[PDB]
Each structure stands twice: as structure tokens, then as C-alpha cells.
């Protein structure tokens, strides 16, 4: 699925929340 249409209406905080949800919080785990 393309995410562009969703991301276009979101703040940076909301965008990064969604992206980090989809990558399973990769930056914050072993």
C-alpha cells in the first residue's frame, strides 16, 4: 500500500508515529 495520501495530512509527529509503528519501533529495541 502507498502511504503518501495518508502522510500528506499528518504532522511530523503523527507521520513518524505511523512509520515507527510499521517498522516495530526499530530505533528503540535490541
Amino acid at each position: 500500500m502507498e502511504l503518501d495520501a495518508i502522510l500528506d495530512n499528518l504532522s511530523d509527529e503523527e507521520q513518524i508515529e505511523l512509520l515507527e509503528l510499521l517498522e516495530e519501533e526499530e530505533n528503540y529495541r535490541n
Partner: antibody
Amino acid sequence: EVQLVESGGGLVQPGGSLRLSCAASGFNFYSSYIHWVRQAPGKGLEWVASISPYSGSTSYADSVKGRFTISADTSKNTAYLQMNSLRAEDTAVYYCARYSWPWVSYKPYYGLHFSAMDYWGQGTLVTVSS
Amino acid sequence: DIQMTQSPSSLSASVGDRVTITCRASQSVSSAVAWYQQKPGKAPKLLIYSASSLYSGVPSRFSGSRSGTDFTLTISSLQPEDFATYYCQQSVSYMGPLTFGQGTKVEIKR
């Protein structure tokens, strides 16, 4: 084949204006993002501006906000960079480059997939000098 | 803004060696990182996109990896034609600022 061709560069006096063009061929222009990226002589790459022809959304580097305007003519598959109040520090080779649609996609098997600038123009030199 | 701190600024290595170039993002950029190769007087060419995907037509000696906010470009068997300046670039902000690392100049020994 995918092609991006820049034009409009050259010499301009400080405080002057120039308009660059980027003629695109060989891909779905509505279904793209167009970026301008510049390189001062001997220096690194600096993103300048981006546009989505489909939404019309635009974005600019802080270094050019209020002076530069990016636009597109979908009937012409062309993007433009209007540069006003040019300064010596704007002297650079200016490249047009593209993302193919989408900027980012997601499939449970592969994860997130981000686009990158796979095609670039040859660049056009802008010299700001008296 | 998100900064990309690229290292080293220059390196020199013999043909055949394994070369490593790294970029640390100042905050999360997901995997939205590309690597480009620029030869003198030419536009940059894409090597790696989405942190770890090899772009079509690029030799398999190029690879990209991610560990959190740290990103690495590895050139496994360095060749004379690999003389270039290499750049990382992040694009995590949709229709937002794109930022580049400062570049790495690679010299080939002979």
C-alpha cells in the same frame, strides 16, 4: 527512457531573477515528485525545493524560502524553479531529479519501501555576480 | 532539522579492499536513506535506496545496511572506477526537508 533536461541557467546580477525549467520525459509526471538540488562549486549537495504535481504541495529549504518558487505545468510535463533576489551564495549547479510514485509504500512481507532520486538532469550552472 | 553526519570525509584504499562509509542521523529517519555516487562534473548516480536495497544495474559489491540511526555503505572489492564522492540522503519527512551528508571523497591507491 526517463529523461530530465534542465535549462535557464546563466549569469545574473545580485538581486536579479532567473527561472529554471526541467523538461521531463518517459514517466508519469502526475505520478512523481520533482526536486531541485544544487551544488556550489567544490561543495556538497543541498536540497532546494520539491513539488508534487498531483497535489500541488511544495516544500523549500530555509535558505531559499520566500525567494524561490517551485511550480509545475502538467500539460507540459515541466517543472520550474523561479529564483528571486538572488545572492552570490546561490551560485551553483542546479539539478532536477525525481521520485517515482510513491514516496513510501508498506507491505507486511517487505516492510517500508522509500523512494530515492533514480534519475537526475545534467545540471545547469547559475552564476550570481556583477 | 534532521542532520546526516557522514564519515569519513576522505579515504584512500587499495584495489580489492573493503571500504566502509557511515552516516548517523540526528533523530529517527526510519529506513528512508539513499546512497549516491558522484563522478567529477556529473550528476550523482543512485546506488542504494531505502537503506538496504541495491538499485538495478549497480554492481553487487555495493551494499547498504542500517543499525538504528546509523547507516553504512560498504564497497566490498574496491575498483579504480569507484573513485568518486559518495553521499547519504534522508527523506523520512513526506514532502518535507531532504538532507544530505557532507560527502566522502574516495581515492584509489595504485
